[PDB]
From Swiss-Prot, chain A:
Residues 1-221 form the UvrD-like helicase ATP-binding domain. This is Gabija protein GajB. Homodimer. Interacts with GajA; 2 GajB dimers dock at opposite sides of the GajA complex to form a 4:4 GajA-GajB assembly (GajAB). GajAB interacts with Bacillus phage Phi3T Gad1 protein; this interaction forms a 4:4:8 GajAB-Gad1 complex and leads to GajAB inhibition. Disruption phenotype: When this gene is missing the Gabija type I system does not confer resistance to SpBeta in B.subtilis. When this gene is missing the Gabija type I system does not confer resistance to T7 in E.coli. The keyword Transcription regulation does not apply. It comes from Bacillus cereus (strain VD045). The chain holds residues 1 to 224 of 494 of the full protein. Contains a UvrD-like helicase domain. Component of antiviral defense system Gabija type I, composed of GajA and GajB. Expression of Gabija type I in B.subtilis (strain BEST7003) confers resistance to phages phi105, phi29, rho14, SpBeta and SBSphiC. Expression of Gabija type I in E.coli B (strain ATCC 11303) confers resistance to phage T7. May be a helicase or contribute to GajA activation.
UniProtKB/Swiss-Prot annotation, chain B:
Optimum temperature is 37-42 degrees Celsius. Its EC number is 3.1.-.-. Component of antiviral defense system Gabija type I, composed of GajA and GajB. Has no detected ATPase activity. Expression of Gabija type I in B.subtilis (strain BEST7003) confers resistance to phages phi105, phi29, rho14, SpBeta and SBSphiC. Expression of Gabija type I in E.coli B (strain ATCC 11303) confers resistance to phage T7. The gene is gajA. Residues 1-242 are annotated as: ATPase domain. Homotetramer. Forms the core of the anti-phage defense complex. Interacts with GajB; 2 GajB dimers dock at opposite sides of the GajA complex to form a 4:4 GajA-GajB assembly (GajAB). GajAB interacts with Bacillus phage Phi3T Gad1 protein; this interaction forms a 4:4:8 GajAB-Gad1 complex and leads to GajAB inhibition. One of its GO terms (molecular function) is endonuclease activity. InterPro entries: AAA_GajA/Old/RecF-like (IPR041685), Bact_Antivir_Def_Nuclease (IPR051396), P-loop_NTPase (IPR027417), TOPRIM_OLD (IPR034139). Optimum pH is 9.0. Keywords: Antiviral defense, Endonuclease, Host-virus interaction, Hydrolase, Magnesium, Metal-binding, Nuclease. Rapid, sequence-specific cleavage at physiological concentrations of Mg(2+) (4-5 mM) or Mn(2+) (15 uM). In presence of >20 uM Mn(2+) has rapid non-specific cleavage activity. Pfam families: AAA_15 (PF13175), OLD-like_TOPRIM (PF20469). Disruption phenotype: When this gene is missing the Gabija type I system does not confer resistance to SpBeta in B.subtilis. This is Endonuclease GajA.
Amino acid sequence: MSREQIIKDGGNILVTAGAGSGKTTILVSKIEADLKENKTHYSIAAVTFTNKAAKEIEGRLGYSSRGNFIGTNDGFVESEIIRPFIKDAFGNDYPDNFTADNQFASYDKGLQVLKYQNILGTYSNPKKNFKFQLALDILKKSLVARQYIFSKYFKIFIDEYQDSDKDMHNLFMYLKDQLKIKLFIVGDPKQSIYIWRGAEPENFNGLIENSTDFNKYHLTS
Amino acid sequence: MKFSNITIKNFRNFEKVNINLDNKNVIFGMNDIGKTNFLYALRFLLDKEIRKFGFNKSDYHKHDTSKKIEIILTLDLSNYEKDEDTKKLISVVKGARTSANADVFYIALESKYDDKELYGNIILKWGSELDNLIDIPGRGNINALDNVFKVIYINPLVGDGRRKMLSYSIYNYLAKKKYEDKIVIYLIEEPEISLHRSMQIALSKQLFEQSTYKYFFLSTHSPELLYEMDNTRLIRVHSTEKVVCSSHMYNVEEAYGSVKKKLNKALSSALFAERVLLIEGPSEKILFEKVLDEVEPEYELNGGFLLEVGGTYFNHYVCTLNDLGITHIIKTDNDLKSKKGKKGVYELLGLNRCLNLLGRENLDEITIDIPEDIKGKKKKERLNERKKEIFKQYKNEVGEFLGERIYLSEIDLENDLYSAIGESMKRIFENEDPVHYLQKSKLFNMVELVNNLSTKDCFDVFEHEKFACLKELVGS
Amino acid sequence: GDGRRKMLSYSIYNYLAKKKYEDKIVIYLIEEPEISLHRSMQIALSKQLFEQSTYKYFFLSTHSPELLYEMDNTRLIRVHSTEKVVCSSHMYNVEEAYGSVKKKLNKALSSALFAERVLLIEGPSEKILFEKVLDEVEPEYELNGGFLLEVGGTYFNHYVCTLNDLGITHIIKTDNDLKSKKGKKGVYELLGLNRCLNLLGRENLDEITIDIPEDIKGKKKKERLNERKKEIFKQYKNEVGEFLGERIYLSEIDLENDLYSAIGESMKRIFENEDPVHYLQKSKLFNMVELVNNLSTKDCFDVFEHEKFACLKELVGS
């Protein structure tokens, strides 16, 4: 079946797989194949929505001294973009300390909380994201941030793309286009029950029905 | 992308030393203690198996453990777009860089002695700004800096030259496949211990014309290893008790392309000297060797050298020697070269070669009638009179030359030698004009002359004013 | 540095083995003394070994020609580079005639002892030309055991005796020279033929006389002497054939004319508006640099493959 046409493909890929298809198995197989094939210094990043899937993938992959990021997409920005390069973009007064109750309805008040209060902000409206817009703002203001992101990873694995806001799409597409980093997207179109958290199913469907540089496969197993 | 500089303070016999670097570096000199301590400092900074231990009381300068050891290395990150080693460095460093300083990086070492525990702890830092460095993170026995650099140390100790070449080959084709994800630096210490000459030349070609040795530091006592040198830093350690170092960025110009094998062979043996006298041909070699053997037999034991320059300009040799701190003396004579094509116009070759070493360059040409009737000795004396006039005209320039240790003859060396030993030359060259006869066969007649010179003639030549370069060579 | 400690060790050896062993026969075995030694210290040790009475008996193994700068009155033993041990030995001495140039012979011959084939040349012009040509054609000739030796203004006997006795292949390239005798005018010595004959056991030859009227001078005299050289070369044809069997190559006139016979068109191109040979012979050193700076690979392969340059094929082992 098509499960052998994926491991042999290197680049941008989609996998429109429904429930019970075995997304974890194919994701782990592709990750292991990519790591075994490549002999360079580059790494991979696997971004999920829950800590359970992150820990499952971490346990399945094993142990290595190569630095790969496995975790949630909220931890990705905090660990890679915001915490290291916040002061290089805005200034030395902006703090890199935070432990995240204090949600507001504006971006400027989010910056004010992060600075004066010294705690990561939030938004009251679930249709808009503070983390993934601040991350993209930092990426466009810091040259060393973009340099590190380009020098570090050669592929990023994304799963459950249907439950993604517009800011997540913006950041991922910025990475794909402006920084020339490959993407591996897996998602079920009919699993948008998380719409109560601001999920936008239109992004995955638009990618499926309009993308020209994406290779598309479907799994019925 | 590029190594730039290194600073060492209060470490062993180093007190405060600043050395400029490149990717390929060669260190040479007569100290032989600072040369090894240089590589030890490099190993301490970049080698985890050496840094794994601490610093003793003997590692501090003057054994005064109340001072701090600092070793700081500088890199250039200008070619991030075209280099993949810059990415290897940048992927482990994240946050220690700033955008205003995106092209320079620092790696530092610091040690302070503990008198109660009798231990010297080593702590590493990097940063883009030298006034704001932070500790390199790590867990357990491992460091974040150990993920980047791979230091390969080569030493013959701790026919058989073929076994050495096999060792070099296995090194070259092992460090490639296994370390495609690291930055590899080679430290080669005296590779000529029990090595045949041709094998030394082969290793020189490997070092300077193969891509397997992008970064290395080499210590050598042999000029055969330097037959192929190009695009390298030469670091010279001065022969004193206080470590003093001079460095030069060596290159060969595209103009000096067809004679590159002669420049390298000539200059390799002069790098291991203290004073060098630059001469033209083998006649001067014969004469000065005879005179020095008669007067100063041990001139070459004390660091003297005679260098044959040939048919080129002095810039290439003088730049290197001056930058390395070696004293250079030049003896030349006033030459007129007939221009290619038009007849009757000559070039002030000697004056031009002497001027180009003073920054001032080139001079206008001259024209001499030389009617077709005259020919032979008459033409020679006509040209000699013109040379005398030219020499008298530029007296101030000649006085400027003498201040730079440049000695230009009015006509030639034969006439200067006559002005000193004319009676002896008349005796030996019976029934001829000594200068004219000596100028017929330069090589055989010079041997005839030296075979009939006594100690009195040698001391007459040595003590003359026209031969003041020989006193400079032997240090008076 | 540590070489000074080595010199101190040598000094203590010398002034300890004397007082303590005045009643014994002392033999020194010195093995590779140049391991971590500066060049000047190697020269000093050479002087100590060959000009001091403390070392009456010794055996020395070396890889360095700087230790041999002072050699005299010694056996040189050469071990051939094979699997079966083969050795050649020579009793080296320097004649009283070769007394004022002894420092040049030793320096020249020290580096040729560590070679397999040696080509003996005259001056730096041939050095420049052959270095350019070999770098173009055979870049690794010196890795395989080739050497170029500048002989200068002496005879070939001193070098050839040593090299032949040690088993090293020697090639000689020379040209027909006439040297005006000291004193009487109009008589010249067949210097090139005499130097080539002395290597065949036969020695010296009768002189010749050429009119050379006082009217002619310059290029006319040069061509008169060149015609005389051509006649001399044609006269002793059998001797030249004998020379060729000993790996001795004598030019009819000079190297400039042999180079013309090979690359005349290129020389005419480069030396525009002059006679190539006459212009090239004005300034020997600068004009050779001018020539080599404008030669291509085609010219180098033309020179290499010519019959007048068959010594270069001998040097590289064909």
